[PDB]
Amino acid sequence: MIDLIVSQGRVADRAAWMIEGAARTARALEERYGLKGHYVGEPAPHADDDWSVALPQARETLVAVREAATESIKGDNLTVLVNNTCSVSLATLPVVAREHPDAVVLYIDGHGDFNTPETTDTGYLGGMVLSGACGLWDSGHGAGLRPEQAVLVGSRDIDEGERELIRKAGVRVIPPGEATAQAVLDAVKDAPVWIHIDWDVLEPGSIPADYTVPDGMLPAQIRAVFEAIPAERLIGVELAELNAPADSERAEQAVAVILDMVAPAFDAAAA
């Protein structure tokens, strides 16, 4: 009762190992849950190209992710997308909002990902994902997600202008120190839920973290969110931006922490 879809095509990647991090995450989920992922797109090396160049390059991959996710959303299973970059969600979030106009999108990310072509400082498409899905600029892959239905969770240190774009659109922001499970449940109310996770939301993991207050979200906070959302309300989950080389012990250790965070939701969907 889980559908696993895996992006392996470049979607504006500026990091070297996010396609590889996606592949390793999918492999861990295949082994734990007895699943076989549907792998979409062909890898291409990372580059520092402008969104206006990277976006057309990604069209084939984005269109294929859209069709796979659409079928899954219309079916009876939990839709799980393991995505190299948040930019894959320019294809999926318009489908979520059209199929489930009452869904709340929990966009869990250390960033706001709410830049527009006018406001981006770096030209990076991955900084423009949530604004594109919400129609502030035209990605060519649709929009229709109400900003009033989007909640940024874990975001912090947002550029002043971007923060005002978020505010004016009506996107709520729950910073890591407010992002308890109940705070998230309060934001969702009775709505069905789509969860999008960018792993740079997580506090850089240190061992003796008992005596300092973290700046990012802790894995335990992410797990508590997955424990809190009722399985009957969970539409789907996107896991994005694990930058870890294939065959590395780093990737091995990272996917074990990921599986621990997602287990309450994925175990329930499987059984």
Ligand SMILES: [Mg+2]
């Ligand atoms: Mg479903």
Ligand SMILES: [Mn+2]
């Ligand atoms: Mn992101």
Ligand SMILES: [Mn+2]
């Ligand atoms: Mn981010």
